[PDB]
Amino acid sequence: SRVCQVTGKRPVTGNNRSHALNATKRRFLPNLHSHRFWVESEKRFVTLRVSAKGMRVIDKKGIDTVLAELRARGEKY
Amino acid sequence: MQVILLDKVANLGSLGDQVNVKAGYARNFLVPQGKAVPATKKNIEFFEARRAELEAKLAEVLAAANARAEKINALETVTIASKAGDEGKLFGSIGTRDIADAVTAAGVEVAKSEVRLPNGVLRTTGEHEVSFQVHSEVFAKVIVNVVAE
Amino acid sequence: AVVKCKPTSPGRRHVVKVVNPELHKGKPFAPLLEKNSKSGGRNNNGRITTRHIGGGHKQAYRIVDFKRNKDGIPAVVERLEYDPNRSANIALVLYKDGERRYILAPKGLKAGDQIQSGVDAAIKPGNTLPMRNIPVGSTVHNVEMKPGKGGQLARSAGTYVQIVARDGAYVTLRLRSGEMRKVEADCRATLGEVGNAEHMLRVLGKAGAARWRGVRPTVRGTAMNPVDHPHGGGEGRNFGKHPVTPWGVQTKGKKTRSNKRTDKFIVRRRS
Amino acid sequence: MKRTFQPSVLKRNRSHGFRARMATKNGRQVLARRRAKGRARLTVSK
RNA sequence: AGGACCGAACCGACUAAUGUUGAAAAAUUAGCGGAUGACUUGUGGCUGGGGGUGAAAGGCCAAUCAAACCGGGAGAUAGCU
RNA sequence: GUUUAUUAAAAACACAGCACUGUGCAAACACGAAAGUGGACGUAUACGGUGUGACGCCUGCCCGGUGCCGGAAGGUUAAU
RNA sequence: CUUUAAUGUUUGAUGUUCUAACGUUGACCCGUAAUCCGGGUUGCGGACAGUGUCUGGUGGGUAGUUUGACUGGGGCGGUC
Structure with a gap:
């Protein structure tokens, strides 16, 4: 897919509509980006694709606090 | 957010200083570089009582690094160190001349530079010469070194 | 060098071909030969992407x-x-x-x-x-x-x-x-x-000459329906309209390609 | 000649097969259809 | 040497005639064109529907292709018969 | 030579040949929710498009409109 | 206080340079007697390209639809 995993934020089919309010969609999507994160515990780079609203929220609970909760919905191989 | 500093780099910082910083210093400078820890209201007491030990015993042999940040964003050096100038004597081996690489570069295409006049780079006391290529027929020799703040 | 095949037969009427002395045959070393070389213009999930591709000799790719x-x-x-x-x-x-x-x-x-x-x-x-x-x-x-x-x-x-x-x-x-x-x-x-x-300096001499060069004929649009490509309107023919690609952009002028990265390394564009 | 049908046994077994159709999800709806309809004639799935 | 000539095979269809409640959902019959290459031919594989494919006619795609097949939506709707 | 399978096989299409135009490889372009793929494991004497059609002799006049391209300096003006 | 200077200063431009982001379609190592891939190591580019959201412009490129009626047939003309 194309999801945040962190906040889960995913593509919806929303529309900005028309000016005569005809049926049309183009989708609103998240801001997924690969940002280079790294565990210290297993000491390697574990680069995740996550949104930039997602990023604000990572900051707000503490970086390694959302990452403290991660690895119970882990993605790494 | 806010931070307790761990460094003194640019015109901010002072080797430990609780200041407010933004999200250009977080996720774009100090972090991600180990050059800060958040200050929240928990941290603010932990780190601060902690920093009057750490940011004392350690601090005074690491002054090289703190300094070079300014010198390389302005540009006047192509040699860098995290210790060098903190005994009267220079330390490291970083520098284009003898790593067989190009570093401290972000506009210049080069990826090689050859060694010319053996003096050592951050291995002889005082300044040393670094010689840096842009062709095999055009050159730019210079006199560079890393010292403490 | 370049030699005219004098009128002898139609399609031999006017032929330019090139023979040169360096041609020596004996085949390069087998490890430096592989496979064939016919593609067809198709994707690796089928369906020809690129038309005018197919035909040509067997060939072998030669590993250079x-x-x-x-x-x-x-x-x-x-x-x-x-x-x-x-x-x-x-x-x-x-x-x-x-x-x-x-x-x-x-x-x-x-x-x-x-x-x-x-x-x-x-x-x-x-x-x-x-x-x-x-x-x-x-x-x-x-x-x-x-x-x-x-x-x-x-x-x-x-x-x-x-x-x-x-x-x-x-x-x-x-x-x-x-x-x-x-x-x-x-x-x-x-x-x-x-x-x-x-x-x-090899400028062929016949239609068949060009076929075996790996290429199939390029059919001009104006000799094909509106729908297939504009400027047609067969039975009695039609003409009009500023000239377009099958992708609908103007073919005449209309400078393309910017990437603002590899373009930063180009210093003076063409005349 | 221009006849629509004329035998190619291989293709039947390998394009209309049990297992030459089982992989695709849609060619499992076909099996499901033709099992619950009581169909068991088999259109050369051997 | 030749998209070379003539001319079987073979690949194909321009004429004419016969057939048209045919031997045939395009034939039979007699000519005809090409007939060493832009050739033609086997096997298998690979391309898909508003798409392919097309030396290009809106041609061709399972006796359907300027409108595919199969199932459903569905009792679409018919001021019409 | 190719062609409206099976009533229209040609003066049609195609064509060597001519000219314009795009495009420096992560190429133009094209395909594909994407990854990625074709172009090409080629690469400007190339790769793609457009129009004309051996060969010969030639290819006049007009840039306004329209398009496209160049100059946009300045002015106008959106979201905010 | 201005005109204007300088101090405490704020900030946008450009300018330069940088990595600490971020990309790499350069080189090398290892997983690996896998040219795929990842990380590592190095080089490069570098706050840029680019993408998300919003936005103006363009956009028969694409789509859904419409484009009235009377009438000595309809057209056509006149008409409402």
Whole structure:
């Protein structure tokens, strides 16, 4: 897919509509980006694709606090 | 957010200083570089009582690094160190001349530079010469070194 | 050289073909031959992407190298034969080091030439070195975008490019179209021209001649329905409308390609 | 000649097969259809 | 040497005639064109529907192609018969 | 030579040949929710498009409109 | 206080340079007697390209639809 995993934020089919309010969609999507994160515990780079609203929220609970909760919905191989 | 500093780099910082910083210093400078820890209201007491030990015993042999940040964003050096100038004597081996690489570069295409006049780079006391290529027929020799703040 | 096949039969009426003395046959070494060379223009998930592709001889791909990393003891030039998988004439080179390397046969040969590539090379057309040991105004073929990438432009027949600048960081070259672009100074490239120039001087003579060159006929739009491509309106024909691609953009002028990154390294665009 | 049908046994087994159709999800709806309809004739799935 | 000539095979269809409640959902019959290459031919594989494919006619795609097949939506709707 | 399978096989299409135009490889372009793929494991004597059609002799006049391209300096003006 | 200077200063431009982001379609190592891929190591580019959201412009490129009626047939003309 194309999801945040962190906040889960995913593509919806929303529309900005028309000016005569005809049926049309183009989708609103998240801001997924690969940002280079790294565990210290297993000491390697574990680069995740996550949104930039997602990023604000990572900051707000503490970086390694959302990452403290991660690895119970882990993605790494 | 806010931070307790761990460094003194640019015109901010002072080797430990609780200041407010933004999200250009977080996720774009100090972090991600180990050059800060958040200050929240928990941290603010932990780190601060902690920093009057750490940011004392350690601090005074690491002054090289703190300094070079300014010198390389302005540009006047192509040699860098995290210790060098903190005994009267220079330390490291970083520098284009003898790593067989190009570093401290972000506009210049080069990826090689050859060694010319053996003096050592951050291995002889005082300044040393670094010689840096842009062709095999055009050159730019210079006199560079890393010292403490 | 280029020889006219005099009127003898229709389609022989007017033929230009090229015969040259260097053609010697014996087949290059099996490890340096692979496979066939017919594609068809199709994707690797089926369906032809690119029309006008299909046809042509069986061929074999011939496994070529022009990177020329070796700088050891000089080499020698062996046979020459036209390499079908490219637009220029090849020669196998054998190093005395124990290496086999291809070269696109640059003019003035002794079929035993002493290839060495250095940081001054053997200083003769047909040796690769890093593009900083030359002056300006040199002719250079197998210019590259990063060192260790190898040759990729100026690799046809008689394609090479003038060094216009190369002082300070970066090397500007004048590509054959007027196009100045500044590439790195680190990049290798071969001194001197590329060999063969009779690619242009073979101008076939018949329709069938062109079919077996790997290509199928290009059908003009205006001789095809509106829907299939504009400017038609068959029965009695029709004309009108500013000329368009099948992708609907204007074909005449309409400069394309920007990426604002590789464009930052182009210094003067074409006339 | 221009006849629509004329035998190619291979293709039947390998394009209309049990297992030459089982992989695709849609060619499992076909099996499901033709099992619950009581169909067991088999259109050369051997 | 030749998209070379003539001319079987073979690949194909321009004429005419016969057939048209045919031997045939395009034949039979007699000519005809090409007939060493832009050739033609076997096997298998690979392309898909508003798509392919097309030396290009809006041609061709399972006796359907300027409107595919199969199932459903569905009792679409018919001021019409 | 190719062609409206099976009533229109040609003066049609195609064509060597001519000219314009795009495009420096991560190429133009094209395909594909994407990854990625074709172009090409080629690369400006190349790769793609447009129009004309051996060969010969030639290809006049007009840039306004329209398009496209160049100059945009300045002015106008959106979201905010 | 201005005109204007300088101090405490704020900030946008350009300018330069940088990595600490971020990309790499350069080189090398290892997983690996896998040219795929990842990380590592190096080089490069570098706050850029680019993408998310919003936005103006363009956009028969694409789509859904419409484009009235009377009438000595309809057209056509006149008419409402």
